[PDB]
Amino acid sequence: ADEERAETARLTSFIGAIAIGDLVKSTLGPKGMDKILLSSGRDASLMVTNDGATILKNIGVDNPAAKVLVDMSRVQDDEVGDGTTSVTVLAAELLREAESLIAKKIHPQTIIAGWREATKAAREALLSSAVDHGSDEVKFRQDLMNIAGTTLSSKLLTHHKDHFTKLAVEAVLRLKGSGNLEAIHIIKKLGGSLADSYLDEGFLLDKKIGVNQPKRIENAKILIANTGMDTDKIKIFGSRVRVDSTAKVAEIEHAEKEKMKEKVERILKHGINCFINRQLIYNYPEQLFGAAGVMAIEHADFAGVERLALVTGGEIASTFDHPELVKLGSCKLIEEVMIGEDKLIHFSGVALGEACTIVLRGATQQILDEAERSLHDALCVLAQTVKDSRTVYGGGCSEMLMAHAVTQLANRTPGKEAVAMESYAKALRMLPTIIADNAGYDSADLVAQLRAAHSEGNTTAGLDMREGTIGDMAILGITESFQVKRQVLLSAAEAAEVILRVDNIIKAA
């Protein structure tokens, strides 16, 4: 309806991007200042966060260029985990520095083309700032610890943070020689204390059945199955619905009853002590299992039931296509214990001892949910740090070192590409200035000092925003991985260049 010409498009685009960059610059890092989430279009209730990711989803935006920022933020959450807020801020910064170039006389392509060459130079610099760590078991422990503690604070939860950091690093530590998460279950569950938390060495289903059914098995034999009882997974032993009579309502209820029982028999014929079902277990087959000697767990999860099947050494039935013809799993012990004020089922003696479950114990629901997410972003990080066991010196130490790399390049160059190099270095450097405000210690002194170190060549002083001074980094509790950072640099740039390149914004609203 409206055709926004290249300049006019630039301003809307810039202002879109920037409005978003303020919110996430404040949320940033462990001392970062909170956001207030406001539910729009429906009520006006509030929640307080410090997570940059949540700002975007909860509170949307109608600016076309700002929508690109939202798409980008999604990608960090899953694949990398942490860095959802860290990216969004740098991308807005890159555009800010872009503003002065479009004005001067300088076309958008000039700025793009020279930031691509600059991204390649920054990456080379990310490798240099990346020193290997956590090759040996002792160092490997120390290595997971630093990254994981970073993540939680930046996405909210900083009170009970340390207890969860011990369990999370131990969990990844067991795996050894693979970055699985396909055995490390994450269970968030009501009951327990906020201080206590538990890692069972095995696998743990938090689903229970009371003390009215068996729960004590020694030398357990596992059948993993998806068996309907009312859902009615195939291997029917009931009837079709037909209507021929006014008493026919009675006939249906009975026919379901023979169905439930004939399926109990087929399960029974495996020769097992522990039966797990993703689906419902009706009141009638439940009692028939408790009598047979077989444990009943109903309402198992789609993630956990499958994931259980691998570790224990079973195999799933897959919609009850295997009624006696699927191989078992085995565990040494099945004990019911009370951890918190809950009853849990504890699989122990699991075949692949890689498997662990991390059980989060809330006593405020607001904490328990936010904690699950922030800890999941952290475990995404952890498992990539298996593939390459190295860290970079975080804190603003890397950002300056990429900025500087690109400043020395910038100097060499006098062409069209050279222009944007000046812009690119400034953009990277503008991130510690944000970290400096978050500290609450004036930016100009710190960032200038930091700058000085890295020219001479040093990555053994960084910014401590936890002391408000320029300090050592020697793999402390405030470094960042290489894993998170490579992806964060790549995406910020990539997003900004797509925003630059779109200047033929036709809005038909």
Add this chain to the structure above:
Amino acid sequence: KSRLMGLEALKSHIMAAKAVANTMRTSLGPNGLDKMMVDKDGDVTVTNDGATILSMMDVDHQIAKLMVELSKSQDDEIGDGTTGVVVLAGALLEEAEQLLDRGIHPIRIADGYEQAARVAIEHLDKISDSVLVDIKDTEPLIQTAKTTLGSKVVNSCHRQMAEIAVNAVLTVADMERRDVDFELIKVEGKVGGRLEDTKLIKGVIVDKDFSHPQMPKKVEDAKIAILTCPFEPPKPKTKHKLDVTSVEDYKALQKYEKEKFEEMIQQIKETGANLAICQWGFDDEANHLLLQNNLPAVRWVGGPEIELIAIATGGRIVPRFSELTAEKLGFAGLVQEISFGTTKDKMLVIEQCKNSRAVTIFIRGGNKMIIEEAKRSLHDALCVIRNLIRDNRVVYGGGAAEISCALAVSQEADKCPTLEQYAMRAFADALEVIPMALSENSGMNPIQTMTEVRARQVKEMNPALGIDCLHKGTNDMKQQHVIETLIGKKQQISLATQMVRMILKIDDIRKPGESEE
């Protein structure tokens, strides 16, 4: 009432065209800057090409409405240069306005544009070759492949997508005349793999129906039994339950399904073929039984989907189960089942070496955004080689051809004078807008870069030496590797001129206030 009369009406038109023109101008060449369309649901899309962007765009004026039609013809034959016709058409008017202010009528210039188009084409024909063969057009097609990929979905050559793209078009050309359409070739995309997972399909690809990932998957023969009749009892695209009123009739209904599996399996076998395409379906249990019995069905085939296979094979679909003979079925040169997606179920490829009238190149994609861009490159590729088959010529285009023609048309203004003089002057600068705005979007000054190439037009003619179109320090078009078809650039010249001829026609600037509703 309100009335924009004569001159006033003409001024209005000029304002519409230059705004449309400029959006297109900053999208010229692979140094182009992308288009983002936001709709009325706020759904964001990234596209490129003149033709597509206009079509989505709600027309706000008269010249805007005219351009959409114009663009779509450029898109069908040529498949590139869609944005470049538009830039030229609006540009030429932006100069006509300047002529108007001097005191020349739009009438005088508009006749001399038609003449100035005629002289531009003439000059074009001298530029580059006009003789190739189809095992030697391939090196320009590789030059077309660099630019076309590397401004859309990727910023790089991908040799796999390009080479798949060019074969498909050749399969249809040798069946009739050395001519192909844009309805005999298609890019069908289905998400599951990555953009580099691709196939060359020589006929068509249909989803192959499998009830479960424990049922057998076989293929055999080289021939397709195209049916609408059953290959196992129907269930013809509507809900059904079971309407038995005894236990007895349920038990009865299962054995009757067993016999019909066998009997259809044999009837098809006997004629030849054993993979069936049936328009109708049947529930999940009956299908599972037939897959176990072996000799795979395809069940739940669209009403369009069957028409697609038939047109490509050239044969017919039986209306009945009675009437079956090998003649009455369509003819394939191979049927083989290929893994669609990279973690998804197998599909059925029906390649044909018998007859071809629909050759699909099967592209896989991840997201909805990345597939739509990737197919955008494909469409443009199908079209440039369509021009070659019919008559084999290429031109160096990107800036090279336009400027060389421009200098030529300029020179004749001063050989001729009279009526066409002003028209020639304006036409020669219009042609030069095309390399110019390409440098505007790109990293380097528009005036400076235009001046550079113009120097080498006096020093040498018929140049492989245009402006940068890989964003380089050097400027060529042999080392920037942009090639257009000679006919393709030729078709632009016609089209731009055209727009001017259409606005001239009547004198009905009278409006009741209805003129863009």
Add this chain to the structure above:
Amino acid sequence: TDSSQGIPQLVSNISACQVIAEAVRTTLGPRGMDKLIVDGRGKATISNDGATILKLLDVVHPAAKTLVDIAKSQDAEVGDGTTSVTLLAAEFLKQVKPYVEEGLHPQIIIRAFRTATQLAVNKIKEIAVTVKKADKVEQRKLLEKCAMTALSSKLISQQKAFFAKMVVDAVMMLDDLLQLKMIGIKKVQGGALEDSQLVAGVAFKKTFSYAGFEMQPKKYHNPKIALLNVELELKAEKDNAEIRVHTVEDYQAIVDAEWNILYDKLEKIHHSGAKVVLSKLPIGDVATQYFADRDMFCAGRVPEEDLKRTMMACGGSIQTSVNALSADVLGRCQVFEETQIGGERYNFFTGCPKAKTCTFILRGGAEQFMEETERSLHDAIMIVRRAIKNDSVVAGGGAIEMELSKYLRDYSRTIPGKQQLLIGAYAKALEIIPRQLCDNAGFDATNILNKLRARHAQGGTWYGVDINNEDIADNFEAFVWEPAMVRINALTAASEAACLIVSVDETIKNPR
């Protein structure tokens, strides 16, 4: 209830006319200056003559409505010169408008419009040259040079002679009208633009490809044509429906029973005699199965107008039922040939028994070449057709109008008082039409008009302005040859239209 009266009221009515006269100002050739007229129904509209669009306008004056009505009168008779009538009437009134202020309000005006109109018609008819079709020419070669007149204007190079001799052949054979309706010209994509084809009969532009379209026959030597304004497809007769289930055979039975009804429809007409089935409504995918297998030809998705030409020429007739109908609702040809030309499949029906359509088939293979050829061939067919009916031919170009304006200048001297003034306005008004030809050719219009009067005072020849060459010269010796009769009609209609408006100056309106 409204009433308005006065000398300023008269002035109103004329002012309205100017507004419609501007809409149609120039359209004589292909130059002027247009604005696309898009309606509120969401349709984009242009035409090849500007009087068409003008008909659609609804004028809120009754006086302005008269000038609309005479447009409709001209268009129906000649089919040309419709524009011309608006211009003369309006312009006459324009130079009269300031004369009304001065004193030319009296009804005497009507009398003067009659003297000027009656003389002028007679002068055309006498000066015009009466030429046989067998004088010293073939009938086709007289009309060759007249058909060229439209063809030279736009914008078709040297193929113009060749096309001209071709376009004639269709018109002579049919002749009995002055309209192009029973001829037409059909564009075809692809093929040679260095020759075109004259087909006696009808043809179809495109029939869509269906499943076993090449498994259907393309040639017949006694095609018997079924004209169907119906369709059979999946949505015209169903092939999906609910059934009871208690056996597999129930499912088979329902699809089976439906396929029978659709098979009945082609069979019943095939047994009458049909083997060619022509339909303008769609034919589907299920539909085309039966045909492909029978080895009986089918066609769907052919234009509604084209199907109606097929009726006249082959002697077929419309149906609305295809079951159990005679064989006297069928037409025949002697030749059915299907040749795919360009991207589109082309059906040719020729060998037609009474041949009440013949039509030129123009092959170019573009959109650019073909619309300008079609535009010129539309007006070609108008000049040649009307040359059979009135065999008096005069110079066009507005050359003869410049002579009338001379002639009437003379007359104004012996004709008295208030009438003289009226005559001087008639004379000035005749020069407007050629002024626009000067605007189209690219000249200074006022400079030019004066040079043609000089050779209408130094010989009385045929000097006028050419758009058919874009120069100034004799138009008779340039073969710009069009009948006397277009000019006879346009004068008399322009006076008639005029007299009504200047007479009304008291308008009573009711918005009831």
Add this chain to the structure above:
Amino acid sequence: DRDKPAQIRFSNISAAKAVADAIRTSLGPKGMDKMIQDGKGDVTITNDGATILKQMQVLHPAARMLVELSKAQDIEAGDGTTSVVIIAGSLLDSCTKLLQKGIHPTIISESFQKALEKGIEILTDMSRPVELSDRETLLNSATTSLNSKVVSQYSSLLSPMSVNAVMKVIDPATATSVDLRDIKIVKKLGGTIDDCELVEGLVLTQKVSNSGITRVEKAKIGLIQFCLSAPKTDMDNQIVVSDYAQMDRVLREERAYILNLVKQIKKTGCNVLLIQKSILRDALSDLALHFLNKMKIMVIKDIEREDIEFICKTIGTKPVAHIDQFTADMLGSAELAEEVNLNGSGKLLKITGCASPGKTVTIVVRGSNKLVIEEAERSIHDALCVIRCLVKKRALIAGGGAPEIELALRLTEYSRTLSGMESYCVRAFADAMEVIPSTLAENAGLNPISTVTELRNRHAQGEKTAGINVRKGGISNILEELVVQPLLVSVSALTLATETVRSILKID
């Protein structure tokens, strides 16, 4: 930039201060009652701080923290609901000053928790232990707190009864925490304050059953949360009517169903059943109820969702929401179940003696007129809340507003010795404290700034000296007239206040 949060935050502070101003003149026993106009056009007369904020607040983000802040206060102490708002707004006055100066918000938020941690030290040294297993010590501390509360007229009689409930739920020396998750407030029509009593088991509301037995000893506590009839049709019953025949066909199903359920309950062994409403359970049959009572099982029908969750923890009679889950484990052990129709008209079920985890006491509070019953309900609440606060935190501190000056003065001096950029934050925070005893003195009637200057000087020299005294209106020792507050009641006011001020400063 952070300019636009700067501008938003000041606007939020100003709105929060304005709402908080009304409550400074409602503070303490000498508080000024507030006539509050609802969006409903009704005047509400209150002197309790918390409900003023709740009943109507402005639509700004700091205003909302205030409702939340006092809501948190209620669960934690139950006391200092009024005072907790006072310190919050007073701190936000201090913050504007810091901001302008160029002390960043991050600094003021960590310094404000650091100053709480530093404040609690100074407080404790002043505090003085009392016994938590002795009845008399807890009563004196509770009695002093009651004179200060709004309600006091019948609180003399309710105070020894408030301790008695709490003493039974204290069994070790640690004295647990004592929540209201073990002390149950039940009301009964009719009776006096002297008739009120502490029932060992739980007292349950209503009592539906006149065909049942009326006294059964050695009873088994059974819990129903399953139906007594086949599911809804259109009524809670399966039975519905639209034809004579239609009712018959449903009755065939229902009849079978009601006998197997009533019988199943009896076979497991129960003599008390706890049944909910006919809008909280999808079916119940009058027919099934007549039989269920006539088997000689004591029934209460009709009770709340809140009640059912309460019982399940306290007397260990765990959920039974299905037939399958009546097993022995779920059942309680009651010593007696009894109907009482004395000491207030109407019939309630008393279970006296119950096998229980923890220990659960219930006080049936009672009174002659409807308004007498409500005054005593307020009175036990006030009385119990202070006891629970002291058993959590053994030491005892003074009231009267003197501790509040005494912390401040120390916190100023210490801050200067320590120094730092955060010095300004901890010094201004201490001065934030000086507002509340000053605001209190004005309500007692004496020129306020002059009162708080003088008490500072008495604290500086002597320490434990003068405080705001209700007799004098002014400056006289609170050592001669004991005004005590539990240590948790003051810890709560400060730590909650800081947290709220922390969120607002952090909020963009």
